[PDB]
Design a protein around this ligand. Structure first.
Ligand code: FES
Ligand code: FES
Lengths: 128, 128
């Protein structure tokens, strides 16, 4: 019992892949299934200049990540940080409640990748 | 304007502290404020035998972590994994919408600590 939008993003996920040498990297595992979600970001002019995700997880996780990465592309870091699964709640309505977990991977990995980038920036400016 | 339950868990948070040499460790940062949530778990008989959190974050993050860790204490790993912020949505009703992010740290760190423990266990399988 899924949604048309989820079906579209599972069948034709956007932004699948890897970035070599990314500016930010975030990885989160779902321990139930043991699936791992990785987000890679490139940052230019404090905007998401490129984003990719890689997972072997389930339909729900893949479709959520496709929607989240699409939303994030070309936004400022601060805007991207404010994205949560809540921003695509309507597309996810009526999913089995155990797919809640799967749907949280995307946003949590994105937030991790952004924090990764930001902490690198902080370290660079240790003494300045 | 906050909830009475949130006020109680912010003023008297349960399970604050650290576990030295924990069975599972999970850390997640909120990049907006730069606050970091750490969860420590001890695992005995595939149950949460001890849990502690450590953060310097905001009231919302602290109260959520107090509620989440209290829910997790003494549950099986599998039950604990199924906990999300959704399980305390009622207590969190009407929080400023930016505290959604803060409220997700707790569950995400707990899930990270459980994955940490499980992957350590996975090491044994390499034995052949
Ligand atoms: S089971 Fe691996 S993501 Fe749904
Ligand atoms: S301000 Fe850092 S946790 Fe909400």
């Amino acid at each position: 019992g899924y949604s048309k939008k989820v079906m579209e993003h599972f069948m034709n996920p956007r932004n699948v892949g890897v970035i070599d040498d990314p500016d930010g990297y975030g990885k989160v595992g779902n321990p139930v299934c043991g699936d791992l979600m990785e987000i890679f970001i490139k940052v230019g002019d404090e905007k998401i200049e490129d984003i990719k995700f890689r997972t072997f997880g389930c339909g729900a996780a893949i479709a959520t990540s496709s929607m989240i990465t699409e939303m994030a592309r070309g936004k400022s870091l601060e805007e991207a940080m404010r994205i949560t699964r809540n921003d695509v709640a309507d597309a996810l309505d009526g999913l089995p409640p155990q797919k809640m977990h799967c749907s949280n991977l995307a946003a949590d990995a994105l937030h991790a990748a952004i924090n990764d980038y930001l902490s690198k920036k902080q370290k660079h400016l240790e003494h300045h």
